[PDB]
Design a binder for this molecule. Structure first.
Ligand SMILES: NC(=O)C1=CN([C@@H]2O[C@H](COP(=O)(O)OP(=O)(O)OC[C@H]3O[C@@H](n4cnc5c(N)ncnc54)[C@H](O)[C@@H]3O)[C@@H](O)[C@H]2O)C=CC1
Ligand SMILES: Cc1cc2nc3c(=O)[nH]c(=O)nc-3n(C[C@H](O)[C@H](O)[C@H](O)COP(=O)(O)O)c2cc1C
Ligand code: SF4
Ligand code: SF4
Ligand code: SF4
Ligand code: SF4
Ligand code: FES
Ligand code: FES
Ligand SMILES: [Mg+2]
Lengths: 42, 217, 59, 230, 431, 62
């Protein structure tokens, strides 16, 4: 119960884990808002 | 004390605008995702992630990588230069395969942080900021890493190692030398920062859902 | 402390100490000093003209 | 109308909404000390030389960026504002180089004049000063970087007026430097104006170097004929 | 009514998985009570959540200790035309503070649910979590927890049987303590240098991307879901008045068992150290000084920490301030001036350089303290240094100048004889 | 050196108002050109306009 440590999986995280998870997550996001132009410098 | 790193760039055969750099198609997909998170008006926000991704593809940031990031995000190159020279996790100079950062701030320094630094120096035979000749290890002294409870600690390539003794850091170093990857986390088997022999809190099993909910909800 | 004839000095290396700041010209109560300056061939800040009228000087 | 009443040294003035404390002081006839604020540039607030005391408020406000509120009584000659000015001037002069005799901006220095009128008359800095390497941005603007006080007027003018994003700040804290980070000439038809807006001798005129002192010059108002703008 | 604080029951804590022994994952979180009646909380309204937070007496856990209900109500103005955002601050910059890290690595789902609840309360369209650049494994755990919540429909499209759309994005910093400050946080999110902006405008008016934004600490965000479920009154009772709730305390330095533990608010400092830290090394008689709220707070000697509580008001009356509830202890076998000089040196390397007071004065302070460590200075300089600190403090854009000046003030105030003795010894040994 | 021949090369007079100067010039018999005083017009300054949501004013750096 209490004795075992359950956070080990992070022992097998690669260099691209964060960005791969973000890529998977991108399909679940609502459409982003728009300010009207492409950039403030436009 | 003093910084020791220059904030002006001079063209070098291994660091110049004609140095070859580009993004892998998977990295391009990652860049598209990163840009997508922000609103369609301010794509300038992606500069810190994408630059980091460039480093994760190269290990350091040449001027060509900064220029490529500026070209992709359509921001002036000078802004990318400011971002690269501002944040300290960006390597504008080549770095070793294993980047060792040893925190020496007061909470870690109190629990005898200098012994670990000197042990690493003696093991590698290099000074505080130098790099080993075979381009394998790099030693850096940094500010607090948010692991004060686990001090003394050092961080290597996204991995935290806490509660180090001199001996422990020697085993970490030569295990990195051997080829395998050491397991991150604190030493002495204290399992992420509870009291070593106390266990004074969170003993009884945790309560079930809706245990303390108020009436009318 | 005696004030006599004017002189321009130089450093032990042999380069003149004057940097054409024109403070002596500004403070001169009799307007006895005239100074013109330009960057030297090595980029040093040196005078091209430093005249003092001994007959307008009040010493 | 929509004018609100504010008091500068106990004197009532009617101002538009959004008017800054600095402009409220201007309307009555006082000029607040400044190094980074410019009318034609965007507000920065970096220098902290405009810090003034608002009565019945424990903390001094930046007059160049803080909009005035109705019923506020500014205290421009209060002891707190004078102490703040002296402290900021001390911090500004702590690392500044003893270059006044060789600096082309001797009698035209805002740093010098504001030290004379708002700072102290002596230093208590017992350390060694810093030195940064100079930059080359072409044949028109001579750059002596150690003199620079990090006001950022040049960056704002280049980005907003000249439309050129070549200038920026690199590094962090004390070692932060204003420049281009690469050998690159900032050349534009409006490039010379950064000499005027720079309060110090960090940016000077290269063809004009070492030739004259400001108190000697006779000023003649005239018209340009190099184009039809006049 | 209660007079003694510091005996908090095991079942009565909020972070029941602080030590990461239970399965943090979504299954484990549900087992521990997480994501329970979220729809009921969403459907009950934002005004109800704001009122519960107000009556809860909750104050910012980041350091300032500002009433969080007041800020979240500052967001409660009607729509303007711009999207509204909730930015969670996970920078975790302050030395000696590890609380944010533990409650992100071993308990992400409470953070995610608190993000959703706070976004509903403030009408935010999405949540941006600025995780520290060094916390990579913590960021990956938070990302996989967010993915699990998206899979279960807990956030995102309609987020519940509610009709409220909410996104949670995670952005990573790059080695910058100044980025913890809320306006510098916003600037770093927008791709510029982590330089703070001036106030006004406040983030509720012009924040991230120019949109109204509310910035909250990770600890502050986590408590809201639990607070709503158990009610404002339950949270309010703990601690003293205007200091209600439970706090995470990180005890480190010269203690036998340095640890992070959640406990009641107005616990005595000595009682907390003895109960959870295992006592100070060498016995309580060996203690020399304590920094209660991280480096940005003045130290206090033994005579003050003997009978001092742990909350905003009592620690302010001790001329320290609670800060980030980060206890760093120092016994009588350590060089205290060296520790304070190391803190000032850290502040010298962590200033953004935007304004002249912080930049120049903090570099000057670092040099002066480096001279003080060896005793190379003179006694008349000590007061000078004090004056320097006064000049820097309250004249800067942000509070990093305060966090650099306050340690110097505390060290001078409580150990001037030590500095004079070191100076005299240097004069003797050098003649 | 720089030689001159007019006695009035260094003569500059100061007046409180334009009318006083005009009166002095008229009573002393000098033909004059008067130039109206230039005043910097009031300007609308806003710090928050730097951090604009959709407008061009937003600054790339600060
Ligand atoms: N948790 C950590 O890692 C660190 C914490 N800190 C702590 O941060 C504290 C100082 O932070 P600050 O934000 O500068 O203090 P602050 O009191 O000025 O502001 C803190 C919060 O209160 C809000 N606020 C304050 N006055 C307001 C007003 N008139 N209207 C609307 N909102 C208002 C602000 O929007 C902000 O969110 C320090 O005490 C320090 O201990 C410092 C470094 C690191
Ligand atoms: C230099 C500096 C660094 C800071 N770093 C942090 C940080 O890492 N985390 C944090 O929550 N607050 C930090 N703060 C204070 C923030 O203002 C705070 O996070 C924000 O106001 C939210 O506070 P709340 O969670 O109490 O509402 C910092 C403040 C300063 C001046
Ligand atoms: S110009 Fe006059 S005051 Fe200046 S350096 Fe030369 S001699 Fe000295
Ligand atoms: S810029 Fe001004 S203060 Fe600095 S050296 Fe030149 S004249 Fe002196
Ligand atoms: S060069 Fe001049 S204008 Fe530019 S930042 Fe420095 S002092 Fe300001
Ligand atoms: S006080 Fe320091 S960190 Fe804060 S804005 Fe000024 S220079 Fe930057
Ligand atoms: S002081 Fe070393 S990790 Fe915090
Ligand atoms: S003039 Fe206001 S801060 Fe510089
Ligand atoms: Mg100039």
């Amino acid at each position: 119960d209490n004795s075992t440590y359950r956070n080990l999986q992070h022992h097998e995280y690669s260099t691209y884990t964060f960005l791969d998870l973000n890529v998977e997550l991108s399909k679940f996001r609502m459409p982003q808002p728009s300010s009207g132009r492409q950039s403030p410098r436009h | 004390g003093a910084g020791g790193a220059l904030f002006v760039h001079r063209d070098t055969p291994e660091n110049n605008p004609d140095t070859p750099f580009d993004f892998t198609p998977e990295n391009y997909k990652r860049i598209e995702a990163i840009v997508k998170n922000y609103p369609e008006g301010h794509k300038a926000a992606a500069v810190l992630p994408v630059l980091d991704l460039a480093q994760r593809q190269n290990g350091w940031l040449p001027i060509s990588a900064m220029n490529k990031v500026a070209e992709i995000l359509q921001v002036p190159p000078m802004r990318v230069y400011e971002v690269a020279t501002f944040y300290t996790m960006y390597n504008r100079k080549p770095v070793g395969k294993y980047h060792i950062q040893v925190c020496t701030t007061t909470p870690c320094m109190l629990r005898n942080s200098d012994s670990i630094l000197e042990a690493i120096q003696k093991k590698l035979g290099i000074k505080v900021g130098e790099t080993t000749p075979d381009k394998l290890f790099t030693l850096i002294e940094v500010e607090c890493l948010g692991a004060c409870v686990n001090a003394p600690m050092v961080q290597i390539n996204d991995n935290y190692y806490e509660d180090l003794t001199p001996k422990d850091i020697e085993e970490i170093i030569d295990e990195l030398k051997a080829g395998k990857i050491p397991k991150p986390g604190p030493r002495s088997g204290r399992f992420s920062c509870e009291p070593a022999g106390g266990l004074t809190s969170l003993t009884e099993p945790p309560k079930g859902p809706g245990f303390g909910v108020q009436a009318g909800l | 402390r005696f004030r006599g004839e004017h002189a321009l000095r130089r450093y032990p290396s042999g380069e003149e100490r004057c940097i054409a700041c024109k403070l002596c010209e500004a403070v001169c109560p009799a307007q006895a000093i005239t100074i013109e300056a330009e960057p030297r061939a090595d980029g040093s800040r040196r005078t091209t003209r430093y005249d003092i009228d001994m007959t307008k000087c009040i010493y | 109308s929509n004018l609100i009443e504010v008091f500068v040294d106990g004197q009532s003035v009617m101002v538009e909404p959004g008017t800054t404390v600095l402009q409220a002081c201007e309307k009555v006839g006082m000029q607040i000390p400044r190094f980074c604020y410019h009318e034609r540039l965007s507000v920065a607030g970096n220098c902290r030389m405009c810090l003034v005391e608002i009565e019945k408020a424990p903390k001094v406000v930046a007059a160049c960026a803080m909009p005035v509120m109705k019923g506020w009584n500014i205290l421009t000659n209060s002891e707190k504002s004078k102490k703040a000015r002296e402290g900021v001037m001390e911090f500004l002069l702590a690392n500044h180089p003893l270059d006044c005799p060789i600096c082309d901006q001797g009698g035209e220095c805002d740093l010098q004049d504001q030290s004379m009128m708002f700072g102290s008359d002596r230093s208590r800095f017992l350390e060694g000063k810093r030195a940064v390497e100079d930059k080359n941005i072409g044949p028109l603007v001579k750059t002596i970087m150690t003199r620079c006080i990090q006001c950022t007027r040049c960056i704002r003018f280049a980005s907003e007026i000249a439309g050129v994003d070549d200038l920026g700040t690199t590094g962090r804290g004390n070692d932060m430097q204003v420049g281009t980070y690469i050998e690159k000439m900032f050349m534009s038809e409006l490039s010379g104006n950064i000499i005027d807006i720079c309060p110090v001798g960090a940016l000077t005129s290269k063809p004009y170097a070492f030739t004259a002192r400001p108190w000697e010059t006779r000023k003649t108002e005239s018209i340009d004929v190099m184009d039809a703008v006049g | 009514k209660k007079t003694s604080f510091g005996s908090l029951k095991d079942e009565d804590r909020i972070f029941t998985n602080l030590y990461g022994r239970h399965d943090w994952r979504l299954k484990g979180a549900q087992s521990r009570g997480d994501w329970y009646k979220t729809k009921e909380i969403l459907l009950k309204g934002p005004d109800w959540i704001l009122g519960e937070v107000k009556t809860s007496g909750l104050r910012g856990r980041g350091g300032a200790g500002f009433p969080t209900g007041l800020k979240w109500s500052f967001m409660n103005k009607p729509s303007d035309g711009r999207p509204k955002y909730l930015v969670v601050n996970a920078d975790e910059g302050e030395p000696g503070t590890c609380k944010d890290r533990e409650i992100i690595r071993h308990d992400p789902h409470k953070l995610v649910e608190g993000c959703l609840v706070g976004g509903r309360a403030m009408g935010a369209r999405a949540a941006y979590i600025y995780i520290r650049g060094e916390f990579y494994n913590e960021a990956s755990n938070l990302q996989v927890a967010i993915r699990e919540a998206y899979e279960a429909g807990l956030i995102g499209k309609n987020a519940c049987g509610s009709g409220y759309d909410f996104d949670v994005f995670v952005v990573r910093g790059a080695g910058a303590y100044i980025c913890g400050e809320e306006t510098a946080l916003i600037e770093s999110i927008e791709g510029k240098q982590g330089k703070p902006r001036l106030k006004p405008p406040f983030p509720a008016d012009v924040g991230v991307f120019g949109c109204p934004t509310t910035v909250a600490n990770v600890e502050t965000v986590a408590v809201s879901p639990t607070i709503c479920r158990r009610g404002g009154a339950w949270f309010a009772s703990f601690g003293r008045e205007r200091n209600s709730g439970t706090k995470l305390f990180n005890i480190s330095g010269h203690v036998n068992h340095p640890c992070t533990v959640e406990e009641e608010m107005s616990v005595p400092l000595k009682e907390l150290i003895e109960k959870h830290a295992g006592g100070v090394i060498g016995g309580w008689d060996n203690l020399l000084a304590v920094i209660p709220g991280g480096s940005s707070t003045p130290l206090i000697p033994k005579s003050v920490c003997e009978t001092v509580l742990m909350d905003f008001d009592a620690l302010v009356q001790a001329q320290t301030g609670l800060g980030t509830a980060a206890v760093i202890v120092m016994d009588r076998s350590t060089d205290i001036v060296k520790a304070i000089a190391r803190l000032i040196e850290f502040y010298k390397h962590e200033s953004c350089g935007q304004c002249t007071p912080c930049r120049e004065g903090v570099d000057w302070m670092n040099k002066v303290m480096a001279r003080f460590v060896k005793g190379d200075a003179r006694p008349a300089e000590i007061d000078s240094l004090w004056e320097i600190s006064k000049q820097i403090e309250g004249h800067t854009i942000c509070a990093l100048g305060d966090g650099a000046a306050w340690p110097v003030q505390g060290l001078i105030r409580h150990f001037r004889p030590e500095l004079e003795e070191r100076m005299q010894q240097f004069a003797l040994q050098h003649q | 050196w720089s030689s001159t021949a007019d006695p009035l090369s260094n003569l500059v007079l100061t007046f409180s108002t334009k009318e006083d100067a005009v009166a002095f010039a008229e009573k002393n018999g000098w033909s004059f050109d008067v130039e109206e005083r230039k005043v910097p017009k009031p300007k609308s300054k806003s710090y928050g306009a730097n951090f604009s949501w959709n407008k061009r004013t937003r600054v790339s750096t600060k």
